[PDB]
Amino acid sequence: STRNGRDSEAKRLGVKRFGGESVLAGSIIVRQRGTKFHAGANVGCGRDHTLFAKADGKVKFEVKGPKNRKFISIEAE
Amino acid sequence: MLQPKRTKFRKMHKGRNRGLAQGTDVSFGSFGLKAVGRGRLTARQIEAARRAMTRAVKRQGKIWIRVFPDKPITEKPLAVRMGKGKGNVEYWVALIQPGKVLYEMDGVPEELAREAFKLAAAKLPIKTTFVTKTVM
Amino acid sequence: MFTINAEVRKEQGKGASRRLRAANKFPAIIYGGKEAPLAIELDHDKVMNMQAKAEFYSEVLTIVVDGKEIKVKAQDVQRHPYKPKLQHIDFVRA
Amino acid sequence: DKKSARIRRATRARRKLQELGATRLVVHRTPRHIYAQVIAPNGSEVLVAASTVEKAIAEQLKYTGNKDAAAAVGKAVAERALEKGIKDVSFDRSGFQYHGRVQALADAAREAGLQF
Amino acid sequence: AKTIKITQTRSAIGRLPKHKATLLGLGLRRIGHTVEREDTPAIRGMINAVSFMVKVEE
RNA sequence: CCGACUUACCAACCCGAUGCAAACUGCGAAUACCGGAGAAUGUUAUCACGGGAGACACACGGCGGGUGCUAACGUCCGUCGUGAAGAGGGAAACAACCCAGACCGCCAGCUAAGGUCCCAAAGUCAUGGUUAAGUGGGAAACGAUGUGGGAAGGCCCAGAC
RNA sequence: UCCUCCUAAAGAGUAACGGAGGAGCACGAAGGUUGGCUAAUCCUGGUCGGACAUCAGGAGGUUAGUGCAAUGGCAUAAGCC
RNA sequence: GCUCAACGGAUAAAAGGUACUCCGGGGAUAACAGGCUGAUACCGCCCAAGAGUUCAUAUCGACGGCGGUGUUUGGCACCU
RNA sequence: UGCCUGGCGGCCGUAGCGCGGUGGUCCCACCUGACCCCAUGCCGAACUCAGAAGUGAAACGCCGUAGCGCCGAUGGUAGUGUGGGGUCUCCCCAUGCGAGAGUAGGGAACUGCCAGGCA
Ligand SMILES: [Mg+2]
Ligand SMILES: [Mg+2]
Ligand SMILES: [Mg+2]
Ligand SMILES: [Mg+2]
Ligand SMILES: [Mg+2]
Ligand SMILES: [Mg+2]
Ligand SMILES: [Mg+2]
Ligand SMILES: [Mg+2]
Ligand SMILES: [Mg+2]
Ligand SMILES: [Mg+2]
Ligand SMILES: [Mg+2]
Ligand SMILES: [Mg+2]
Ligand SMILES: [Mg+2]
Ligand SMILES: [Mg+2]
Ligand SMILES: [Mg+2]
Ligand SMILES: [Mg+2]
Ligand SMILES: [Mg+2]
Ligand SMILES: [Mg+2]
Ligand SMILES: [Mg+2]
Ligand SMILES: [Mg+2]
């Protein structure tokens, strides 16, 4: 009772371009909080761990790695 | 009266009670009191139904209680309007689904347990039945 | 010693098994590793009574499917949550 | 493990050259021999490899596994690589400190036309 | 190849917005309306989606 | 003094078994959403720019919930439907529930929900069972040789109740 | 007014005087880069020294750590020199 | 250069009494009564530890459970 | 062409842990010495240099082993989209999707490009 009723604005995170979509260079793919999806081929990683395209093509999600970590990669097709 | 000590969160959502129970077998003991209905069964109806059957078997035999409340149920006071915060916790209930084996006991002849479990089933809101250990 | 008659199941699923269990029959399967599993249907009242014997879970039973006899052992069982009934019996090809 | 620490010492440097897509010249060093091979950006197939275990290199060398022997194989890998048209490589380290035999392995190869 | 006849037997008053578009895809307009469509794994997927309003004399 | 004998005791960590969790997850659907291709259907149903508005008091019902007492024709959200702004038939009467969306006329026919003994249109219809209570045509724990069906069990013509 | 989790119904968003906690800063290194390193907690042995200081081996493995609340993350360390 | 923190910030600059009161509106919103609900209250029942010298049910009845009426204190704000 | 050893990957526990055995011609590891290039918030222990006396003990690779880790059916169960129904704070019917846990079982990897030794 009382001493509550506070919350913050939703940050609108999540995947913006799902698999198989054609992106242009520099377009945000996922907005993250940690690094849930790591940077694969032809994608970057901003200071918020935002994954952005680096050369236009089709997005592709992968599970490469000894630790089974999700990698987002782009094929220039 | 059964009640958790040092629980993570003081007040809990109401939630719903759908499905069939998990502990449907007599494992620790030999004869059990299996629930047939549905509905929350509080912490005083457990002790009131326990004394009734640790006394109908004198004091001999083992008795197992296979439920625990761990669910705080609040209650708004009297003459208080609605809103202005969730009410304070008053008692603890254990959600029961049809199939839960509530009590079981061992070390007694069957006809003594079948009567002791009858004097405990009269203190419980939900319907109950007498079930016996099976080979599986 | 118990010999139980059974028949193969024409259709399988959820609505095709609750349809059986409303006709006093319940499904069961026989699997033995090196052979294809055999899903069968069999009566309820004739096997719920016979399971009351403690020996049902210790000896090598016999199932008569399409004339031939299969020697099996009761591996597992599923019971109704609050009724003296059955839902499934797992038979291993002993 | 004295080798698992080294293999995880060079992982960050190794995995950047996979991301850059640049041909790398990995180096392996032992208390007796020293190897050096050129590995394509693919990372699964090699192009040029020179080492101190070959009879055509160790036969005119006093002792394999010292600075002047490293300069003998650093010269070799640079001639083979330039012969097939590879000129722009990057130097891997494999966890060895760039101070001793590896430095002379890199310095000699650098002096023979290789660019890194 | 072989055409298929679909007739609507129920109203589309309170149906979900997805079942109102499926009728538009099939081309049915009112109760008792009959249309002759081409048989196809995509057309037969329309019928299954609204297989409580339409009745097919295949 | 060391502990030297002891204790009808409490008891952490682990081991086997049994449960619970919106703020637990070594698992994990159905749907929903995003993108690509392809038929068919729809008077472009889509988007962009411009002229004119109204509206920002919503209600009930189904499903997922928070609050409440899993109380309210209570209150706050998500999605669908209806009323608002929709007449007609049904639920006796009954904005919201079920069927169904009225351009006009006809002393023409077929149906939906719901019904066919009279009020009041249509089966005092056909075959087989159940109920003796006016149950049908309000309500629980619990109690009982009411009655139909089913699988077994015990004793019994060396004679059972 | 701002931040974090749940309610929020597995894309985004989503209310109540619903359930729980925080902020109005810090840092000239606590930033850049290069080189190097791996924790908690238990066992044994040991001088003061004890259940817990420091030392040596073993298990364990990130159950530690992150300037500050919570969530996501982190070994190629985003943790420690 | 602003706890313009009432934090999209009415002024650089601001508290109260009115039962002596007044105007425009609202059953969009309270007091009375009605309405829906029945937490609470009143009435009844179920199991029976026990009291009753013996003896649970002559009379009461613990720890618990299930309902009825719409008589109380309330909840909601549908009518005025 | 086969066997063994070294480097770099694909692949990620059916691939890892434990237990037993086995390998030194070459490769590898331990190893000798340290004034020197270089380093210890002390210590050549680690890093580094100069080499070969010795060993395969430790480590590593290889072979066997299920004692763990791990993978995992078929059948049934739960849940759920759409449409109906009930004595509708919970369920049933038609139809489509269909887990989790568990059972039978599988299992101590597979593979590519180079460079050495041996046959
Ligand atoms: Mg407004
Ligand atoms: Mg509003
Ligand atoms: Mg609203
Ligand atoms: Mg309302
Ligand atoms: Mg109407
Ligand atoms: Mg009427
Ligand atoms: Mg019209
Ligand atoms: Mg008539
Ligand atoms: Mg009546
Ligand atoms: Mg969301
Ligand atoms: Mg959603
Ligand atoms: Mg920092
Ligand atoms: Mg670094
Ligand atoms: Mg840093
Ligand atoms: Mg404001
Ligand atoms: Mg203002
Ligand atoms: Mg006066
Ligand atoms: Mg006035
Ligand atoms: Mg009003
Ligand atoms: Mg209102």
The verdict on B88 touching A (C-beta cutoff 8 Å) is yes
Are β-strands A37-39 and A70-75 bridged in parallel, bridged antiparallel, or unpaired?
parallel
Residue C89 region, left (φ>0) first, then alpha (ψ -120 to 50), else beta?
beta
| Distance, CA of D92 to chain centre | 7
CA distances (Å), origin D113, targets D5, D36, D68, E35 = 33, 16, 19, 80
DSSP helix/strand/coil, B96: strand
Determination technique used: cryo-EM
Beta bridge partners of residue A28, listed in sequence order:
A52
Say how many CB pairs under 8 Å bridge B and C.
Answer: 18
Through-space separation of residue B120 CA and nucleotide H65 C1' in angstroms: 11
Q: Which of residues 15-34 of C touch strand I (CB under 7 A)?
A: 15-19, 21-22, 27-29, 31-33
Domain count, chain E: 1
DSSP helix/strand/coil, E7: strand
Residue E40 sits in a domain of what CATH number? Answer: 3.30.1390.20
End-to-end CA distance of chain A: 58
Q: What is the residue range of E40's domain?
A: 1-58
Q: Domains in chain D, ordered, with CATH?
A: 1-116 (3.30.420.100)
- Name the closest nucleotide to A68, judged by C1' and CA: I12
Q: In the 8-state DSSP scheme, what is residue D25?
A: E
Beta bridge partners of residue A58, listed in sequence order:
A22, A75
CB neighbours of B3 closer than 8 A, spacing ≥ 6?
B43, B69, B92
CB neighbours of D55 closer than 8 A, spacing ≥ 6?
none
CB neighbours of A63 closer than 8 A, spacing ≥ 6?
A69, A70, A71
The verdict on B136 touching C (C-beta cutoff 8 Å) is yes
How far does the centroid of ligand 19 lie from the alpha carbon of residue B82, in Å? 18
CA A53 to CA A73: how far, in whole Å? 9
Chain A CB contacts of B82 under 8 Å are none
B36 inside domain? yes
CA A36 to CA A24: how far, in whole Å? 22
Contact C82 B129 (CB under 8 A): yes
Contact B98 C82 (CB under 8 A): yes
Resolution in A: 3.3
Nearest Cα neighbor of B135 from C58, D3, D109 is: C58
CA distances (Å), origin E27, targets B14, E23, E40, E42, E57 = 48, 6, 15, 14, 16
Residue B77 sits in a domain of what CATH number? Answer: 3.90.1170.10
Q: Domains in chain C, ordered, with CATH?
A: 1-94 (2.40.240.10)
Domain count, chain B: 1
Q: Which nucleotides of G are covered by protein (CB under 7 A)?
A: 2-8, 11-22, 35-38, 71-78
CA E16 to CA E20: how far, in whole Å? 7
B38 inside domain? yes
Chain B CB contacts of C79 under 8 Å are 24
DSSP helix/strand/coil, C82: coil
Angle ∠(B124,B127,B128) on CA atoms, nearest 5? 90
B115 inside domain? yes
CA D26 to CA D92: how far, in whole Å? 5
Q: What is the residue range of B80's domain?
A: 21-136
Structure token pair of residue E12: 């589309």
CA C18 to CA D113: how far, in whole Å? 81
Through-space separation of residue E15 CA and nucleotide F112 C1' in angstroms: 16
The verdict on C54 touching B (C-beta cutoff 8 Å) is yes
